[PDB]
Structure 1
């Protein structure tokens, strides 16, 4: 199964870099917990932003612009990315915007962090039809001394499909 995992500010703005508009170590812990021991697929922009393989995960980089780094697995299409993961229970797609857009139709689960921040960026999470999904988990957290903004974790499972997403 393929899942997407993303942190969304207002207007579905995402940030892949370390310098995110927000500082949410709680969200990074959520990300790590839900991706550990699973393959992660990302585009090259996200790869360069992370800047080292995510430990404890197979790192697959989708790009028609492959780099040379031998520490990760480079693939040239969505289908090839999926094949490179093989027979695992769950493949995690970790962005960025265009990669999420291409993988959404193949995904059956979303792990979202809805962050109460309005921000400057222009990269967005894809459009999805909310009536196509069931919200099977949600948990709101207030900001605290370690986490700059309030946020709500959510897990959605797909119930319906309308082809483009």
Structure 2
């Protein structure tokens, strides 16, 4: 099973200048809980944005060029990325925009955080078709001293 996990600001913005400008510790904790002990697939730009391997997960990087760091696994196509995960129950695709576009048709589950923030961005989550997806979990949180925007954790499953 393939799943996508992402945090979306208003208008599906996910990034600006190879960064995420907001800071929501509660959402990063949600990301860690839902990805730990699973393989994570990411594109090269997202690898450079994170800047280090994510511990406790097999890190798989998509790039058309040879890898430059043997602490992670480098692959050259979507099919190779999937194969490199082996026989696991759930593969987590962690972006960015161009990777999400390619894996969306193959995904059965979306873990989406909706952040009530307006962000200028240059990268968006794919337009997906709402009729294809059933919301099976949603949990709303107001802003607090640690998290400066309200946010909604949602899990959707392909109907």
TM-score tier by shorter-chain length is over 0.9
> Aligned residue for 1:13?
13
Q: Deviations over 1:82-138 (max 9, x none)?
A: 000010000000000000000001100000000001111120001111110100000
> Aligned residue for 2:151?
151
Partner of 2:108, secondary structure, is: strand
Q: Gapped runs of 5+ residues in structure 1?
A: 160-165
Q: CA deviation at 1:62?
A: 0.6
Greater mean alpha carbon deviation, residues 16-25 or residues 120-129? 16-25
Tell me, yes or no, if the aligned pair for 2:16 and 2:120 is still in contact at 8 Å. Answer: no
Q: CA deviation at 1:23?
A: 1.3
> Aligned residue for 1:162?
none
Tell me, yes or no, if the aligned pair for 1:16 and 1:96 is still in contact at 8 Å. Answer: no
Q: Deviations over 1:1-39 (max 9, x none)?
A: 000000000110003889522210000000000000000
Equivalent pairs counted in the alignment come to: 159
> Aligned residue for 1:49?
49
Tell me, yes or no, if the aligned pair for 1:137 and 1:155 is still in contact at 8 Å. Answer: yes
Tell me, yes or no, if the aligned pair for 1:17 and 1:50 is still in contact at 8 Å. Answer: no
Q: What is the TM-score of this pair, normalised by structure 2?
A: 0.96
Greater mean alpha carbon deviation, residues 14-23 or residues 37-46? 14-23
Q: Gapped runs of 5+ residues in structure 2?
A: none
Tell me, yes or no, if the aligned pair for 2:41 and 2:95 is still in contact at 8 Å. Answer: yes
- Give structure 1 regions of 4+ aligned residues with deviation exceeding 6 angstroms: none
Structure 1 30/149 Cα, relative in aligned 2: closer, same or farther at 3 Å?
same
Greater mean alpha carbon deviation, residues 12-21 or residues 90-99? 12-21
Give me the whole-angstrom Cα distance separating, in 2, the residues matched to 1:147 and 1:22.
9
> Aligned residue for 1:124?
124
RMSD after superposition: 1.4
Give me the whole-angstrom Cα distance separating, in 1, the residues matched to 2:18 and 2:63.
21
Q: What is the TM-score of this pair, normalised by structure 1?
A: 0.93
